[PDB]
Amino acid sequence: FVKVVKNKAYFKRYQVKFRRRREGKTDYYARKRLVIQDKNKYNTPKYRMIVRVTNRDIICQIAYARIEGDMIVCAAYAHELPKYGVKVGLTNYAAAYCTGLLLARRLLNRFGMDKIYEGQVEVTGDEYNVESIDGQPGAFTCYLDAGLARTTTGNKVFGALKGAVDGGLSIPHSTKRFPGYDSESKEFNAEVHRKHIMGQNVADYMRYLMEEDEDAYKKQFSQYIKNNVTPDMMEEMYKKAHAAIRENPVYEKKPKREVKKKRWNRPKMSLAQKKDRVAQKKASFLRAQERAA
Amino acid sequence: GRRPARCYRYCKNKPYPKSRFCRGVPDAKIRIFDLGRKKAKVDEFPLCGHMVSDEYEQLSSEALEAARICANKYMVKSCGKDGFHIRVRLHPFHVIRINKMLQTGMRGAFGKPQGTVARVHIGQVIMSIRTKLQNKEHVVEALRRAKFKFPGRQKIHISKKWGFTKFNADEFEDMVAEKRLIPDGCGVKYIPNRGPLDKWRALHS
Amino acid sequence: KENPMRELRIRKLCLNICVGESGDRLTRAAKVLEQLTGQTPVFSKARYTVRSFGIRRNEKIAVHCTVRGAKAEEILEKGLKVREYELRKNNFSDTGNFGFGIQEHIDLGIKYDPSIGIYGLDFYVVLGRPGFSIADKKRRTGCIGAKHRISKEEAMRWFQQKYDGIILPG
Amino acid sequence: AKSKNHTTHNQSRKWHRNGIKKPRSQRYESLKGVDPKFLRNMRFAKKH
Amino acid sequence: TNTKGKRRGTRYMFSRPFRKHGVVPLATYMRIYKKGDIVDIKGMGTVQKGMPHKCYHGKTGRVYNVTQHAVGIVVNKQVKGKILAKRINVRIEHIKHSKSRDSFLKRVKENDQKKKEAKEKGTWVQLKRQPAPPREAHFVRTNGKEPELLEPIPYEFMA
RNA sequence: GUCUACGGCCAUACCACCCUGAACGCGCCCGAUCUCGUCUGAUCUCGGAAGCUAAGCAGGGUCGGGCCUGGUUAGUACUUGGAUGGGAGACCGCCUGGGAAUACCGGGUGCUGUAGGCUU
RNA sequence: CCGUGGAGCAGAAGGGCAAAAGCUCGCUUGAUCUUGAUUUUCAGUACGAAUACAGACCGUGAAAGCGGGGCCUCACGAUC
RNA sequence: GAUUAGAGGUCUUGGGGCCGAAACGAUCUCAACCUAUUCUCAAACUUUAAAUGGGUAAGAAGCCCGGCUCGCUGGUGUGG
Ligand SMILES: [Mg+2]
Ligand SMILES: [Mg+2]
Ligand SMILES: [Mg+2]
Ligand SMILES: [Mg+2]
Ligand SMILES: [Mg+2]
Ligand SMILES: [Mg+2]
Ligand SMILES: [Mg+2]
Ligand SMILES: [Mg+2]
Ligand SMILES: [Mg+2]
Ligand SMILES: [Mg+2]
Ligand SMILES: [Mg+2]
Ligand SMILES: [Mg+2]
Ligand SMILES: [Mg+2]
Ligand SMILES: [Mg+2]
């Protein structure tokens, strides 16, 4: 025959990886270089920006590591955009930009630093970096945590990075992964980046659908038709969303509703139950076999 | 041809087995470690007798073989050709060395391999005989006359276990009747109350 | 009843030709393969050096390509038409995939060019199921469970029912 | 003319008959071997 | 004679524990060492940068300098008939806070607190840790059951 | 009661098979104009929302394997210090202290930090 | 499809290593200039080797960072 | 890494035969193989793992307050 690979010795000698590595969620090799502060800085926090693009949502958080577990100081979710105006299209590059800007403004507004470091109020999509103003508190600084995402040109993590940078946070970066960088010419097209930020790359797609096909367009953008969004008005609604975000970035928690205390999953049965079960299984097998014989 | 056995009786060196470091070791003379009707079940040879060492020493592989031959000869003479089962429970793994003299002297005096011996502790079994209940004095006499092929002092002990097993003979039969151990080959398998119920059903069906 | 989308679909079809020596034969085999598959195939270097087959270390000795979707079922239909929808019990693997070979290529709808010559090839199909991308995606990889995987019997049933073929014993 | 190669037979007695004294621990240990830029800071702070 | 290699005879000392190979847990990197902490040395073979010499393995020293990735510590080494307090630089992986000092610190806080308290009360309280005193007199009550005899068992051979 | 994002300790968390998942979510899933990358839109990247808990995932089950923690083995093995103890030796006994590990037999099968949801 | 490393990492051996220290690509020359401190043999002297820094010029990456030779343990030389 | 012995499975192959044109169709077998067991081992093996032993601490150079300096680190008279 053949050896059994998953042998008792195999399990005895097997060493499991970390839980996050087993679930595939964390790259500890990158985390070690990302979240570790220099020893002569002592307990100076090393803030970092976590951006995670989900199948239906964008998660943006600000976190610094602590022994019992890293603590989140500010967080912003893409599904909060309908409050500010973006009713649909919660995953695209524009939505990433708005959620990053919202996270930045929320941090500063919590943090008492709005009148300083306004950043790029007028979006340009070019290389911008904030400088600390003398006689005033220094600009907030953090580093991007791309996670397991492939950092190729035009990634929505970099879109969120640009959004927060225009918001006012000081994050080191280069205009190489923004949409618009042309590898061959090694140049940056701020206008192309701006149109990607404002969502024109979806507007021309919908107009392209208008050009030839209608049912395919409905299939591709069903909720767009239901929410009554047209290709031309997307730039205006994104501008309005940016204005509303910069106006009122504070977050209010939803009121808590009392629980009815209903258990939805099976509880763990006890030793007495699981022993009675095997006892009666043996009794039943014996009583069945004594007749079947 | 070989040096007297008194020159290698005490466990004076660390165990020096044959391995990738100790090469060129001549083959030990003893190759067969059990004989008789070894292809017998566990319920026909209940009586078990051990020869137990009383000294901490090292026994030569060849002396092991000589004692085995003597015991087998007496057993085939007494209890028939297949009324017993021998088992030598000592394998020679510690090789000994010799620094032969042909005149360098004691320079570079690390020996070449000469033979193999087995290190024996106090109260350790050397040979075991399993047979029927009635051949008790036959077993005792066979082991007694095999004692003369060994150095040091040895004792004969009629074990209270059943055959070559680790279970007491005075409830071995009760336990096998109750089906707590299942016979196989020349031994038994313990069946604890821990496996999946499928095995329990299989062996109670 | 049934789950509407636990059904069986082919997820990739692999074509290969192993010529055993680099050169004009190899590039012409690549040409016929790319004409058949509508895309550029790739060369595979020899893993080791064995002189019984007259090959050495790291030279291209085989040309292979993979297809998905529309072109995949068209090529598979051509191959099964050549093989008159006839397969054997041992042609199916334990994991649900299967395959076969064509001794020469111009029968399945390829014009005979005397310069390129003649070449056989191996067809292989990997039966899939919606959700098999979990086993190979990057972020949160995992197994595909026990119920969801494909067995030899399910592959046989799918082949005999969708393409009304016959599985002769052998 | 062989001879003994190495030993430490009397060494413990020789050490102990004068006693293995611990290093002279004392406050205000020297600042040599400290990070240069932190040292430069401490000098600036003391200066001002 | 022997070899003067820097890692001679460390195949077990610098090895990893059973079923504990792999990525170093980040809590070791996320600890704070200041000037003057008492700290333990335990060489870890997973990282080879800044590995302490084998003679300081298992020794306890005092931190005197903190740097980006490593720490300088003063530790005593017995050389022949004299002890030298020498300072070595160890990367942060091979280091660990000593718990022998925190017990004394907690004891200091606690007996200082109980000295501050009862100062107004005027009562007496013991602070010095006295050694284990001899057991005092007491009564052992039998509950009507007499103690059972103990006798040696007869010799009878097992092997 | 429970999930997601980031985690700490890294199997009491793993492995095999089976049963159940309300809502949100996570997913599977639908396409390749744009960004991006491949022999292949399979992976990666991007644009979505017709369908589904099938799978992942979560909870539970197995006289389950493993793992963790106890009892037994056992005051056994070994061992600090002592004797003008025994023995031809090999070794052993005692006094003064410390004191294991298999087999075998029990119990358990993730805790928890920050932020944000669902159970109106 | 299974596969905790049973392979590979130039060489002896040992330690270490799995989205890596292994394999394949892209770009480069931190194998560069410079003052000190420390460890290893030690007399606590040199050479050799090594470790943390600091000051410039750089490389790479989106970045955090990493890099002043080889994953570590050996591969080398006073005065005139 | 060495090492003895029997048990149960199959065609996974080989060896003696046998009915078979042949047929994993079939008969014994001997084997190699697999699964549970079993005897005996390691200075250059090890999951475990002592006794003896090697460091460190057992306060005034310590704790608790208030305030200054810093060109370092700094969301923050933050951290040090
Ligand atoms: Mg990375
Ligand atoms: Mg003579
Ligand atoms: Mg000797
Ligand atoms: Mg002499
Ligand atoms: Mg001398
Ligand atoms: Mg797709
Ligand atoms: Mg599911
Ligand atoms: Mg299900
Ligand atoms: Mg169990
Ligand atoms: Mg939680
Ligand atoms: Mg209700
Ligand atoms: Mg890498
Ligand atoms: Mg530098
Ligand atoms: Mg390298």
PDB file of C-alpha atoms in Angstrom, chain E residues 13 17 30-31 37 41 48-49 52 58 64 66 88-89 93 124 127 129 133 141 146:
ATOM      1  CA  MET E  13      21.909  26.153  24.774  1.00  0.00           C
ATOM      2  CA  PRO E  17      12.434  24.575  22.570  1.00  0.00           C
ATOM      3  CA  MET E  30       7.048  45.437  22.390  1.00  0.00           C
ATOM      4  CA  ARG E  31       8.589  45.715  25.879  1.00  0.00           C
ATOM      5  CA  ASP E  37      16.389  47.775  35.049  1.00  0.00           C
ATOM      6  CA  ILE E  41      20.052  37.073  29.432  1.00  0.00           C
ATOM      7  CA  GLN E  48      21.768  35.750  14.979  1.00  0.00           C
ATOM      8  CA  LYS E  49      22.249  39.521  15.145  1.00  0.00           C
ATOM      9  CA  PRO E  52      25.384  37.339  23.446  1.00  0.00           C
ATOM     10  CA  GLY E  58      21.504  32.671  32.146  1.00  0.00           C
ATOM     11  CA  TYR E  64      22.933  51.161  31.361  1.00  0.00           C
ATOM     12  CA  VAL E  66      19.253  51.906  25.447  1.00  0.00           C
ATOM     13  CA  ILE E  88      27.908  44.059  26.649  1.00  0.00           C
ATOM     14  CA  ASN E  89      25.430  44.984  23.918  1.00  0.00           C
ATOM     15  CA  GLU E  93      15.397  39.269  21.388  1.00  0.00           C
ATOM     16  CA  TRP E 124       3.293  47.746  66.471  1.00  0.00           C
ATOM     17  CA  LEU E 127       8.062  44.300  58.606  1.00  0.00           C
ATOM     18  CA  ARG E 129      10.686  38.758  56.968  1.00  0.00           C
ATOM     19  CA  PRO E 133       9.793  29.572  62.950  1.00  0.00           C
ATOM     20  CA  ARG E 141      -7.660  14.921  67.635  1.00  0.00           C
ATOM     21  CA  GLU E 146      -7.377   4.198  66.300  1.00  0.00           C
TER      22      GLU E 146
END
